[PDB]
Amino acid sequence: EMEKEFEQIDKSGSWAAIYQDIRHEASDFPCRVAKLPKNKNRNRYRDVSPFDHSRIKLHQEDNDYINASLIKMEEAQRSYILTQGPLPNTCGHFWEMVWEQKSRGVVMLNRVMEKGSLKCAQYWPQKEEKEMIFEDTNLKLTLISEDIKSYYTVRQLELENLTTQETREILHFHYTTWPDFGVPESPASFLNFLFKVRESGSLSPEHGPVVVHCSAGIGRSGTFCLADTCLLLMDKRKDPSSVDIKKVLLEMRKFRMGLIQTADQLRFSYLAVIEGAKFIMGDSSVQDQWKELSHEDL
Numbered sequence: 001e002m003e004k005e006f007e008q009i010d011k012s013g014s015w016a017a018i019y020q021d022i023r024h025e026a027s028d029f030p031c032r033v034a035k036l037p038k039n040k041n042r043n044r045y046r047d048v049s050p051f052d053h054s055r056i057k058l059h060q061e062d063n064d065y066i067n068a069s070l071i072k073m074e075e076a077q078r079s080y081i082l083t084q085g086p087l088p089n090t091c092g093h094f095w096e097m098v099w100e101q102k103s104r105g106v107v108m109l110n111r112v113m114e115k116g117s118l119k120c121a122q123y124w125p126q127k128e129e130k131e132m133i134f135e136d137t138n139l140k141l142t143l144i145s146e147d148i149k150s151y152y153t154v155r156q157l158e159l160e161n162l163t164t165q166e167t168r169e170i171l172h173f174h175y176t177t178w179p180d181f182g183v184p185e186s187p188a189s190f191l192n193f194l195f196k197v198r199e200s201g202s203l204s205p206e207h208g209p210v211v212v213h214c215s216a217g218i219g220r221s222g223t224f225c226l227a228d229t230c231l232l233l234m235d236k237r238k239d240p241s242s243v244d245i246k247k248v249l250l251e252m253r254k255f256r257m258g259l260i261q262t263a264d265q266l267r268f269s270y271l272a273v274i275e276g277a278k279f280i281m282g283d284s285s286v287q288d289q290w291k292e293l294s295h296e297d298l
């Protein structure tokens with residue numbers, strides 16, 4: 001039924017109309033804290049703000065603001081923190097959030113520079129011997145190792161609370177070829193990556209919410225979370241054909257504005273879920289097929 005709906009949307013050529021209807025029906029909640037004058041330099045984009053009700057609060061008394069939102073999907077039983085690409089002055093805040101929320105994984109879907117423009121600060125160390133210290137938050141971050149694939153890289157980071165000396169291993173899943181306002185090369189390349197994150201254990205409820213970000217934390221980040229959530233629901237319900245992706249996206253938009261930024265990212269989300277359903281329904285060949293198709297060992 002999901003592919004029947006997909007098939008009729010394609011035949012009618014109504015992706016833009018469907019997507020615009022979602023934009024029109026999406027929740028509108030205040031973002032008063034994000035808009036306070038003192039928080040202007042903590043926001044990368046003036047039109048992308050976290051709603052007050054779902055924003056992540058830093059545990060510091062000075063200013064607890066960070067442009068990050070808790071997306072809590074009740075039925076799917078999974079939470080995600082979606083945030084913008086950190087700014088030069090909010091990298092300490094970013095890691096303080098990771099620490100305080102007890103996240104185990106960070107999913108990055110953009111590159112630091114895209115088409116001649118900075119989209120995110122270099123918030124993690126590129127070299128083992130050049131660790132980073134965020135003085136304002138008292139955290140130390142070290143690159144332990146990295147596994148570089150053709151379109152994505154997985155890194156092992158060690159985050160240390162300098163005050164208590166406790167250290168934690170943080171896994172960084174960096175998708176390096178997802179164009180801004182665009183889509184992955186194929187459902188296979190997207191799913192291969194998603195399942196790598198799932199298999200790492202990072203999404204387990206024993207850990208805090210995975211932190212997902214792109215440049216604004218809504219387009220690419222929204223696509224990633226929508227597909228994951230829909231696949232979770234299909235695996236959970238007695239009838240996987242009951243999953244209404246448009247309803248799931250409207251639910252996600254109650255927690256952060258603008259998730260899914262183009263009609264084609266919405267269409268791609270359908271393809272990813274339709275393709276991923278094969279695995280949910282049993283198929284044990286699709287995963288290797290996805291890896292092969294993704295050409296990750298290029």
Ligand SMILES: O=C1C[C@@H](c2ccc(C[C@H](NS(=O)(=O)c3cccc(C(F)(F)F)c3)c3nc(Cc4ccccc4)c[nH]3)cc2)S(=O)(=O)N1
Pocket residue numbers: 045046047048110179180181182214215216217218219220221261
């Ligand atoms: O696939 C994506 C889209 C990126 C993205 C999404 C939103 C923004 C916020 C920008 N604010 S602004 O300070 O660059 C900006 C730009 C224009 C107007 C504007 C106001 F509405 F006037 F505030 C703000 C931004 N770019 C547009 C382009 C766009 C146009 C039509 C439909 C969809 C997107 C709209 N807002 C930046 C990156 S992502 O990193 O979330 N992944």
Ligand SMILES: [Mg+2]
Pocket residue numbers: 127128
């Ligand atoms: Mg070296």
